[PDB]
Amino acid sequence: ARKGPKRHLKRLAAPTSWYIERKAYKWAVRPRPGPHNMRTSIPLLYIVRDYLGYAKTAREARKILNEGKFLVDGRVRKDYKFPVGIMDVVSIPETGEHYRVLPNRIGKLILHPISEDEAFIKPLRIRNKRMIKGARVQLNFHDGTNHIVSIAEKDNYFTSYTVLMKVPEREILEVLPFEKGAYVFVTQGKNVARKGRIVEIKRFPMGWPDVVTIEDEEGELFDTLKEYAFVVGTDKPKISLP
C-alpha cells in the first residue's frame, strides 16, 4: 500500500530527543531534509514556539520566522521545518540572545546560553575527507556541510578532527586534532553530555567501529565510540559546555 515518500509524522512516533508533549495532539512537524540527522535535529517551529515561548501558535511562529527575526549559524532561516542540530548557534538579534544547541544527559536537546563573542564560532567534526575534480581536498562535516582546500594542506586535516568556523563568513579559525589528551564532548549514547580527555583508542577487525576511552574531571574513566567523541579543545574546552 506504500507507493512513495511520507509527508506526515505522528506525535507518538516523533524522535525521543524532542521536548514535546506526545499526547496533546496527533501530528508533529516532519523535519525537512537538511544539515543534521532526524534524531539529532528539531524543527525550528518548536524552538520558536515551545522552547522559547515567543509565539503561542504555529501561525505566529511562521509569521515571525518569515519576518527574518531568527538567525541559525548566522544565516536567516524562514521555513519552519528547518532542522536545528547539535553545536548550532541560534541568534535573536532583536533581543540580543544567543544559544548553543547541545544534548542533555538523557539524550534530549537543550539550548545553552552563550556569549556574543562566542556566538561567531561553530565547531564542526570532519566526518569524512576525499578528493574531487582537480587537485582539491573536500571535507565533509558532521552537519553535512562541506569545505574545500588545496592538496598542499592535505595533512592539516583528518577524520574526527574539529574545525572552528567563523559564521556566516565560513572562514577557518583553528583546527583541533584528535589525539591523547584532547578535550572531547560526547554527543550521543549512554554517556551523552559527558566531557573529559582522551586516554586510549582501540581498533577492531572488519567494520566494527573504533572505541575511545575518556577520563572525566573527577578521574572516572568511561568508554564510547570514536565518532561519538567530539573534540572541542586541546587542554581546556574552548566552548562552554556545562
Binding site: 515567543y54 509565539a55 505566529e60 509569521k63 515571525i64 519576518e67 527575526k69 535573536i92 532583536e94 533581543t95
Partner: protein, 95 residues
C-alpha cells in the same frame, strides 16, 4: 474584586506585553470582560484601544479566577497578529 498581576512579560519579536493576573473575589459573579479590561487598563496605564483579554478562566470551587491578556504597541500590529475571533469577542471590531 482585586486584581493581582502575577506576571508581566515583554515580547519584542511581537511588539506586545503579556500579562498574567489573578482576580480574587468572594462569592460574586465571574467578572465581565469589559470590567476586567477597564480595571486592568486603569491600574497598569495601558492604551484602551490596544489591549485584548485572551481569557478569564474560573476554576472549581475557587474564589480566584485566572486571567491572561495582551497589550500591543501598535494597533496595526495588533490587527495583523491577533485572530479575528478574539478581537470580535473583545468587541474591538463591530462585526
Amino acid at each position: 474584586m482585586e486584581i493581582r498581576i502575577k506576571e508581566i512579560k515583554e515580547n519584542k519579536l511581537i511588539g506586545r506585553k503579556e500579562i498574567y493576573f489573578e482576580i480574587y473575589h468572594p462569592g460574586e459573579p465571574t467578572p465581565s470582560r469589559k470590567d476586567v479590561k477597564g480595571k486592568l487598563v486603569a491600574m497598569l496605564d495601558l492604551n484602551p484601544e490596544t489591549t485584548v483579554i485572551q481569557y478569564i478562566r474560573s476554576y472549581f470551587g475557587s474564589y480566584i479566577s485566572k486571567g491572561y491578556a495582551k497589550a500591543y504597541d501598535s494597533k496595526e500590529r495588533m490587527l495583523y497578529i491577533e485572530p479575528e475571533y478574539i478581537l470580535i469577542r473583545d468587541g474591538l471590531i463591530e462585526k
